[PDB]
Amino acid sequence: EGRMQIDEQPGNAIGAAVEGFDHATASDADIDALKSTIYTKKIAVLKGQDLSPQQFLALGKRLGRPEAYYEPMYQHPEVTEIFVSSNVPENGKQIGVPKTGKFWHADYQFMPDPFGITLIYPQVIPEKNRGTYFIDMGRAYDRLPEDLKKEISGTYCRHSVRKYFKIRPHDVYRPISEIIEEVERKTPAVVQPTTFTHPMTGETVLYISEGFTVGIEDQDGKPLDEELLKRLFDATGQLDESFEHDNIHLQSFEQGDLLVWDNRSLIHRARHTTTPEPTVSYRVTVHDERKLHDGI
Ligand SMILES: C[C@H](CC(=O)O)NCC(=O)O
Numbered sequence: 001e002g003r004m005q006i007d008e009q010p011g012n013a014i015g016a017a018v019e020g021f022d023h024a025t026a027s028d029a030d031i032d033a034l035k036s037t038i039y040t041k042k043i044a045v046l047k048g049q050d051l052s053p054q055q056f057l058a059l060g061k062r063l064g065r066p067e068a069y070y071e072p073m074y075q076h077p078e079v080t081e082i083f084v085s086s087n088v089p090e091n092g093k094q095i096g097v098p099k100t101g102k103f104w105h106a107d108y109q110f111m112p113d114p115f116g117i118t119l120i121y122p123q124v125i126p127e128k129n130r131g132t133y134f135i136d137m138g139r140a141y142d143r144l145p146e147d148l149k150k151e152i153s154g155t156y157c158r159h160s161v162r163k164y165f166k167i168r169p170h171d172v173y174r175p176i177s178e179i180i181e182e183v184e185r186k187t188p189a190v191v192q193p194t195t196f197t198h199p200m201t202g203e204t205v206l207y208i209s210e211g212f213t214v215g216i217e218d219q220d221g222k223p224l225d226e227e228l229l230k231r232l233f234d235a236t237g238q239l240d241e242s243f244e245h246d247n248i249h250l251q252s253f254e255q256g257d258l259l260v261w262d263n264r265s266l267i268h269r270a271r272h273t274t275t276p277e278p279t280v281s282y283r284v285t286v287h288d289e290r291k292l293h294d295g296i
């Protein structure tokens, strides 16, 4: 340690900026303070990071245990644990996958054991149409009308990647039904309580997203009408295509920034493709000292 400085946004405003962070030299107390900022301010922006892919993984390893993405076409060619979102060819070749995350989601919400912390290190940043949208789903839960809180009490949700699974090069010429069935086998839909208690803060989190949450079911396992999910998406801001809803936060960044966020509390989305500007980002996703929630 000696010079990491965390500047948290005041009051209830989301976010924090972190100056002087060096993952190779930060103390244990520095790391614990950064993690507390992540869980309470939700998004920590590390400033002035000039890191190789290997150094980025090393930074993630200070915060938790990295997990590689289960579909390897997303993986960086040198570092399996880095997920690459890219639409800039390198020597004419596609690296990673283009145009990822164009829907509201929490990362790995369709998997049984999601990690708690996402790290994004932007490489190529659109000049005009840059940033990622976020909604804090604990704050969104707290803002629901009381009767809507009651209606989801006791319920469970089903989450699946089936809508947004991306076709891979080796899928060409396969019948689509075989791919659909392979997705159901490899990544079956996962049931979770509709709300859970955040292990680090005690907040109640509404754990749903328009992109991955495919059904809601009662306290006894019987499917409820998806009109309930639509009303929850509506109330929490996930159906507002203008992105002006009060719950929505647009997180911008500049070169050298590195975003670290709470993947229990937040859902996120890419912006509309209103410009032809490219995006390249590297992502590391880490498990911290607790499961996503205590029922895992
Ligand atoms: C479906 C996405 C990948 C993609 O948007 O192409 N998975 C992100 C994640 O849930 O970690």
Ligand SMILES: O=C(O)CCC(=O)C(=O)O
Binding pocket: 085, 100, 101, 102, 105, 107, 108, 164, 268, 269, 270
């Ligand atoms: O969830 C996905 O589709 C993968 C990409 C992603 O998580 C993101 O772009 O934020």
Ligand SMILES: [Fe+3]
Binding pocket: 101, 105, 106, 107, 268
């Ligand atoms: Fe994502």
